[PDB]
Design a protein around this motif. Structure first.
Motif, PDB file in Angstrom:
ATOM      1  N   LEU A   1       0.859  -1.198   0.000  1.00  0.00           N
ATOM      2  CA  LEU A   1       0.000   0.000   0.000  1.00  0.00           C
ATOM      3  C   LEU A   1       0.892   1.244   0.000  1.00  0.00           C
ATOM      4  O   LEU A   1       0.545   2.185  -0.732  1.00  0.00           O
ATOM      5  CB  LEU A   1      -0.962  -0.082   1.187  1.00  0.00           C
ATOM      6  N   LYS A   2       2.014   1.253   0.731  1.00  0.00           N
ATOM      7  CA  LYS A   2       3.004   2.363   0.617  1.00  0.00           C
ATOM      8  C   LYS A   2       3.334   2.516  -0.877  1.00  0.00           C
ATOM      9  O   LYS A   2       3.201   3.636  -1.418  1.00  0.00           O
ATOM     10  CB  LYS A   2       4.269   2.114   1.452  1.00  0.00           C
TER      11      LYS A   2
ATOM     12  N   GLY B   1      -6.755  -6.566  -1.736  1.00  0.00           N
ATOM     13  CA  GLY B   1      -7.780  -7.328  -0.999  1.00  0.00           C
ATOM     14  C   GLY B   1      -7.674  -8.810  -1.276  1.00  0.00           C
ATOM     15  O   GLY B   1      -7.480  -9.562  -0.328  1.00  0.00           O
ATOM     16  N   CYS B   2      -7.765  -9.206  -2.542  1.00  0.00           N
ATOM     17  CA  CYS B   2      -7.644 -10.624  -2.984  1.00  0.00           C
ATOM     18  C   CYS B   2      -6.327 -11.238  -2.497  1.00  0.00           C
ATOM     19  O   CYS B   2      -6.330 -12.431  -2.132  1.00  0.00           O
ATOM     20  CB  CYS B   2      -7.733 -10.723  -4.498  1.00  0.00           C
ATOM     21  N   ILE B   3      -5.244 -10.459  -2.509  1.00  0.00           N
ATOM     22  CA  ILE B   3      -3.895 -10.972  -2.146  1.00  0.00           C
ATOM     23  C   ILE B   3      -3.860 -11.163  -0.630  1.00  0.00           C
ATOM     24  O   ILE B   3      -3.479 -12.258  -0.200  1.00  0.00           O
ATOM     25  CB  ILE B   3      -2.766 -10.075  -2.689  1.00  0.00           C
TER      26      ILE B   3
ATOM     27  N   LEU C   1     -10.822  -4.084   7.193  1.00  0.00           N
ATOM     28  CA  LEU C   1     -10.077  -3.524   6.022  1.00  0.00           C
ATOM     29  C   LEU C   1     -10.487  -4.284   4.752  1.00  0.00           C
ATOM     30  O   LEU C   1     -10.888  -3.637   3.787  1.00  0.00           O
ATOM     31  CB  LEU C   1      -8.559  -3.590   6.260  1.00  0.00           C
ATOM     32  N   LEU C   2     -10.457  -5.611   4.768  1.00  0.00           N
ATOM     33  CA  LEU C   2     -10.863  -6.441   3.606  1.00  0.00           C
ATOM     34  C   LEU C   2     -12.284  -6.081   3.111  1.00  0.00           C
ATOM     35  O   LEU C   2     -12.492  -6.024   1.879  1.00  0.00           O
ATOM     36  CB  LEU C   2     -10.701  -7.913   3.993  1.00  0.00           C
TER      37      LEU C   2
ATOM     38  N   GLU D   1     -16.008   3.748  -6.456  1.00  0.00           N
ATOM     39  CA  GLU D   1     -15.971   5.045  -5.730  1.00  0.00           C
ATOM     40  C   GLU D   1     -16.008   4.746  -4.236  1.00  0.00           C
ATOM     41  O   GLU D   1     -15.337   5.478  -3.501  1.00  0.00           O
ATOM     42  CB  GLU D   1     -17.100   6.002  -6.121  1.00  0.00           C
ATOM     43  N   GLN D   2     -16.729   3.697  -3.824  1.00  0.00           N
ATOM     44  CA  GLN D   2     -16.833   3.261  -2.398  1.00  0.00           C
ATOM     45  C   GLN D   2     -15.561   2.526  -1.957  1.00  0.00           C
ATOM     46  O   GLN D   2     -15.316   2.489  -0.757  1.00  0.00           O
ATOM     47  CB  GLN D   2     -18.026   2.328  -2.137  1.00  0.00           C
ATOM     48  N   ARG D   3     -14.798   1.918  -2.864  1.00  0.00           N
ATOM     49  CA  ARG D   3     -13.516   1.262  -2.483  1.00  0.00           C
ATOM     50  C   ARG D   3     -12.624   2.290  -1.779  1.00  0.00           C
ATOM     51  O   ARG D   3     -12.489   3.438  -2.250  1.00  0.00           O
ATOM     52  CB  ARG D   3     -12.749   0.671  -3.672  1.00  0.00           C
ATOM     53  N   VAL D   4     -12.044   1.877  -0.668  1.00  0.00           N
ATOM     54  CA  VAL D   4     -10.958   2.612   0.027  1.00  0.00           C
ATOM     55  C   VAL D   4      -9.795   2.743  -0.981  1.00  0.00           C
ATOM     56  O   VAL D   4      -9.584   1.823  -1.792  1.00  0.00           O
ATOM     57  CB  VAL D   4     -10.647   1.861   1.348  1.00  0.00           C
ATOM     58  N   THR D   5      -9.113   3.887  -1.015  1.00  0.00           N
ATOM     59  CA  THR D   5      -7.903   4.135  -1.853  1.00  0.00           C
ATOM     60  C   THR D   5      -6.640   3.742  -1.077  1.00  0.00           C
ATOM     61  O   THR D   5      -6.754   3.448   0.127  1.00  0.00           O
ATOM     62  CB  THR D   5      -7.790   5.607  -2.262  1.00  0.00           C
ATOM     63  N   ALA D   6      -5.479   3.785  -1.727  1.00  0.00           N
ATOM     64  CA  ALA D   6      -4.201   3.371  -1.109  1.00  0.00           C
ATOM     65  C   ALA D   6      -4.008   4.109   0.233  1.00  0.00           C
ATOM     66  O   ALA D   6      -3.804   3.447   1.265  1.00  0.00           O
ATOM     67  CB  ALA D   6      -3.069   3.595  -2.085  1.00  0.00           C
ATOM     68  N   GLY D   7      -4.106   5.434   0.245  1.00  0.00           N
ATOM     69  CA  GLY D   7      -3.854   6.246   1.451  1.00  0.00           C
ATOM     70  C   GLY D   7      -4.924   6.033   2.509  1.00  0.00           C
ATOM     71  O   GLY D   7      -4.580   5.955   3.727  1.00  0.00           O
TER      72      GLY D   7
END
Length: 347
Positions: free
Chosen positions: A132-133, A207-209, A281-282, A291-297
């Motif tokens: 994610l970093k 998520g899948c990973i 988190l998952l 648009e509802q998915r959480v982004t990297a940050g």
């Protein structure tokens, strides 16, 4: 006269590499190239060399190889693979037919780590944190990777991780040309074969990973595109303005509208050995609405990472520029812009 380069048959194909890069072991094959590990004579540093598959076969093959190179060259971050070198043994522009990119070689990947079960329960927060970093940076340059998988996460001795393989990545606001082959980790909009989507397709893949790391079992299986979507619906539930609208295909509309109608299974019951924080988190990463998915940050600011006491900041990076690569060029014009990039990289 000291040549600069030696020849080595590797898997019955002729590599010609710098005198500095010795002991070519083969490690990977791809649509666009083949990879070997090697030792850098100078430093002792382990190193990956990709021999591009016939990059000047067509205007657009040269364009995608140029794009891969320009992207890798753009991206300087601890958890993103970088370009150390790029060379050709062709001694003239008129002979220029093959060229080689050189990245660090971390030593293994997840997936090789997961196959042989060595992925520690304690190592998982730190590995998902580094992905994610890395993504936070890739996305901040306005790029979508489009093909995150265990194979493309290199990990060293000390569990430090780097995102590999930019040969499908594209500027986030541009067209998503290129077929994503890898099946388990792609978001709906990749599966749906959209020509525009956002960086949250990469969050879906993470998520899948993560799930697969925790459970040692691939979250979504699927024969073809439409079936892989069915599987997704079994964990997520059916949506409204999709099966009566956006499948651009009556046959597919019907399939979805004519199947047994069950609703979002609780991730806890799939991921029976997961931190309740992790589950949370998952559930934020594996949403159908992009648009509802959480982004990297957004992901890194989740409580599941609070324990890492690394505020950091928001490491500023330059957005990549589409425009120079989109310039129309004949094949000869592509050879000359690529050969310019090689010369820039002489030692």
């Amino acid at each position: 006269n000291a040549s600069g380069f030696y020849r080595q048959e590797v898997t019955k194909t002729a590599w010609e590499v710098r005198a500095v890069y010795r002991d070519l072991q083969p490690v990977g094959s791809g649509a666009y190239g083949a990879v070997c590990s090697a030792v850098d004579g100078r430093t002792g540093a382990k190193v990956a060399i990709k021999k591009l598959y016939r990059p000047f076969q067509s205007e657009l093959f040269a364009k995608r190889a140029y794009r891969e190179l320009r992207l890798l060259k753009h991206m300087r971050h601890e958890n993103v693979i970088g370009l150390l070198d790029v060379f050709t043994p062709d001694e003239t522009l008129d002979d220029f037919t093959d060229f080689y990119l050189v990245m660090p070689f971390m030593g293994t990947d997840l997936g090789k780590l997961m196959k042989h079960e060595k992925l520690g329960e304690d190592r998982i927060q730190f590995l998902v944190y580094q992905m994610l970093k890395g993504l936070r940076y890739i996305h901040a340059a306005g790029i979508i990777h489009r093909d995150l998988k265990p194979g493309n996460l290199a990990v060293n001795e000390d569990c430090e991780l780097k995102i590999l393989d930019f040969g499908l990545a594209r500027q986030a606001d541009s067209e998503m040309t290129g077929y994503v082959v890898t099946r388990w980790y792609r978001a709906p909009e990749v599966i749906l074969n959209w020509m525009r989507y956002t960086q949250t397709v990469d969050i879906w893949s993470v998520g899948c990973i993560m799930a697969e790391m925790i459970t040692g079992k691939t979250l979504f299986k699927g024969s073809d595109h439409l079936d892989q979507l069915k599987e997704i619906m079994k964990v997520t539930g059916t949506p409204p303005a999709e099966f009566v609208q956006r499948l651009q295909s009556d046959e597919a509309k019907n399939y979805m509208k004519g199947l047994p109608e069950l609703e979002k299974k609780d991730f806890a019951s799939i991921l029976t050995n997961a931190s309740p924080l992790a589950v949370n988190l998952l559930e934020k990463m594996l949403v159908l609405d992009a648009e509802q998915r959480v982004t990297a940050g957004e992901a890194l600011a989740h409580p599941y990472f609070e324990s890492l006491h690394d505020t950091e900041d928001e490491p500023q990076v330059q957005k990549y520029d589409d425009s120079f690569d989109d310039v129309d060029r004949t094949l000869d014009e592509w050879k000359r812009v690529t050969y310019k990039e090689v010369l820039s990289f002489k030692p």
